[PDB]
Design a protein around this nucleic acid. Sequence first.
RNA 1: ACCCACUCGGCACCUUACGAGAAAUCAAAGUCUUUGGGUUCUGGGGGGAGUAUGGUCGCAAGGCUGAAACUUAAAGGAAUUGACGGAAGGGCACCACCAGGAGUGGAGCCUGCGGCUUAAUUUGACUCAACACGGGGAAACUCACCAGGUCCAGACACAAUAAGGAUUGACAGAUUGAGAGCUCUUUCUUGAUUUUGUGGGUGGUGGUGCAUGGCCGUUCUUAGUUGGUGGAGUGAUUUGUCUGCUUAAUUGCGAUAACGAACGAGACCUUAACCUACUAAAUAGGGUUGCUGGCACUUGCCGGUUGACUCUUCUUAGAGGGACUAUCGGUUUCAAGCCGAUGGAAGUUUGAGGCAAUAACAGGUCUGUGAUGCCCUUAGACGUUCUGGGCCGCACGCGCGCUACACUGACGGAGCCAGCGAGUACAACCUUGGCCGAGAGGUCUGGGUAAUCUUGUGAAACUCCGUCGUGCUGGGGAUAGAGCAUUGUAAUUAUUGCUCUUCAACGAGGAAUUCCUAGUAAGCGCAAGUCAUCAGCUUGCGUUGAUUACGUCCCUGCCCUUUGUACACACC
Lengths: 69, 106
Amino acid sequence: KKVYTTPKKIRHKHKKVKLAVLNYYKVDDEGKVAKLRKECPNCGPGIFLANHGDRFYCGKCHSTFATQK
Amino acid sequence: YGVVRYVMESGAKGCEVVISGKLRAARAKSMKFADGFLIHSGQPVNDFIETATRHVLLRQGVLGIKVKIMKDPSRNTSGPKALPDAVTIIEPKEEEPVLEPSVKDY
RNA sequence: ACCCACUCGGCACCUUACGAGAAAUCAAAGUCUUUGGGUUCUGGGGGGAGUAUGGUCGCAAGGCUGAAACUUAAAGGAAUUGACGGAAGGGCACCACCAGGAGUGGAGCCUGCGGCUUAAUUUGACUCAACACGGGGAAACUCACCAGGUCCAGACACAAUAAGGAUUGACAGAUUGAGAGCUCUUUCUUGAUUUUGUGGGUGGUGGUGCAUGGCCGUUCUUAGUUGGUGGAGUGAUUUGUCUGCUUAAUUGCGAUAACGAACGAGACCUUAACCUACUAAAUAGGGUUGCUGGCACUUGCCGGUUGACUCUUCUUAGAGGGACUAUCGGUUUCAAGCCGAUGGAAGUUUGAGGCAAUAACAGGUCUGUGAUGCCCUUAGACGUUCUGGGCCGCACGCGCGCUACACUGACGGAGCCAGCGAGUACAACCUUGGCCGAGAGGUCUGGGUAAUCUUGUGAAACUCCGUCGUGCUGGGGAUAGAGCAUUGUAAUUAUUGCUCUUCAACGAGGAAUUCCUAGUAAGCGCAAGUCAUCAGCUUGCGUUGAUUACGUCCCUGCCCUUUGUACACACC
Ligand SMILES: [Mg+2]
Ligand SMILES: [Mg+2]
Ligand SMILES: [Mg+2]
Ligand SMILES: [Mg+2]
Ligand SMILES: [Mg+2]
Ligand SMILES: [Mg+2]
Ligand SMILES: [Mg+2]
Ligand SMILES: [Mg+2]
Ligand SMILES: [Mg+2]
Ligand SMILES: [Mg+2]
Ligand SMILES: [Mg+2]
Ligand SMILES: [Mg+2]
Ligand SMILES: [Mg+2]
Ligand SMILES: [Mg+2]
Ligand SMILES: [Mg+2]
Ligand SMILES: [Mg+2]
Ligand SMILES: [Mg+2]
Ligand SMILES: [Mg+2]
Ligand SMILES: [Mg+2]
Ligand SMILES: [Mg+2]
Ligand SMILES: [Zn+2]
């Protein structure tokens, strides 16, 4: 068989990068539990849309939300 | 040999066992163990001769076992009761004929 | 001089050995383990070597005499079955040749295989027995190759994270060939499935057919092969299994230390032929007869209708029968058989096949296999899966084929006849009939899971009358150019179908060499096979249908017999 040449690139996948987990919430003056980031209109509170620079995609819907806010 | 003996006991006209493959040493050979009658050619082959081919797997290579049995034509149940070439004639009966006319009457 | 009979001596010879001998053979090579008549000479595995040396005899060449070191597991003898022979005999075969036919090799083209070329142009096979073969007619798939990307289909075992997350998912654009989250921008999801290593595997159109199976091909579809007694040999062996004549045949008649047998051949089975004899039919065909269409017009002729009734010749297919070389005539040990009539559906094994022995081949397949050993490989995989390309490239060799080089034609009409087939409901099969289109094709409708519909597959070659009459001409059709269709996701590297145009090579093919003996050769289509689409290929099938042997070893190959052999890995 032919001599293996290979033209570079030994790529990999997204290994997740585990950040903080519960950073999309705030708890203040004893008992209160206030929400950070807009909750998903497709499926209610628990799943909250990712807020970027006019980019509003989901996780359970995986991608299906794009409208401006 | 044992197989052949068994076949004989079962009352078959002939047995032919071919064992093909590597039976000691790499260079392989088909050994042939036979007894009795056997036919080979013609339509009486599919009538009386029953065949079997099974390949045996061993950790150095494959064997192939080919077994033929020539069933007795007389013990047939359904189909022809002999080989087509076999012609056997019946025996005549004894005669003391002449002894001059006479008539049996009722 | 013969002739007969006897007799001593000689050169030999023939048959038997009851004796010898390893046997070939031997009246001595006998009277030898049942060993002694008298004597002379010579040998003690093969080489080294009739050499070295010393004598001696020779004019000389040489002779007589004659070692050893060292080397070596054999050298040899007689026979055996093979194999082979530029030995001698006898067979057989259109894969031999005659008598002929049809040709290929020449030409243009399809298409195999080289060689070259290439990122790759994937490989397997190279006399018959590789070369339109791998059912190999590749647009991707196939796919084994190449340029690139994607995925885990990394079992299970043991461990590091063990949820403050193991880890799955990811639109928008740059990313990328790319509505591949391939990822890098991201920060939303996912919940212990897993991932990171180490044991361990699994997949591989990876490798080896020289490790194998199975299948096949070939010796060989040739007539060959074997054992039980008996005979001959000390034995391997041999005879049976053969001088002849026969046959397609070790098929027989025969001859005979063999006799009777088995496998193969034959028998068989499938098919193709005949059946006014059965058994049958509105899924076959008829008859009369209803109604009915056209005729002459007398009753008569051709029709359309599953309207009645009946029939089975043709039809299909069940059960039978029938040919056994029958009858006769020749010819031959008056045998087996062969030849000629005659009758017959049938007289080449009645035609054609299917099956097909003993022994084999380092024949071909590990690219048919969840047939497979071992080796390689095993997450930048030789697993895969997408994407494009390649298998199809051309100075060139050869291998099957198609088309043709015309007047036995060509082109136009018109006439107008087949047999094998195949064919869908979960798909998209075969597809009449009606309209649209010069075509190709559309379209609407159908009929058919089929002796029912396609289909009477009204197929070609053909036959009838016409146009050109032998000029690379209206022979011939290659390249081309443009359009219109069709299949498919995709047609440039024309898939293919059609339309107009273009009109190339070739006036029957050298050295060679294939196939063939009767419904055969050859001509001509059709058909299934692959197939979404593509036929110059293939298994069948019909249609048209000859010429010439009815033989022989001259060539070629095979077989046997006799011989020779120092070969038996067998003349490479
Ligand atoms: Mg590489
Ligand atoms: Mg037989
Ligand atoms: Mg036979
Ligand atoms: Mg010696
Ligand atoms: Mg000798
Ligand atoms: Mg041959
Ligand atoms: Mg090819
Ligand atoms: Mg083809
Ligand atoms: Mg495989
Ligand atoms: Mg082999
Ligand atoms: Mg004997
Ligand atoms: Mg013999
Ligand atoms: Mg006669
Ligand atoms: Mg026959
Ligand atoms: Mg080989
Ligand atoms: Mg393999
Ligand atoms: Mg061929
Ligand atoms: Mg029909
Ligand atoms: Mg022209
Ligand atoms: Mg094609
Ligand atoms: Zn969501």
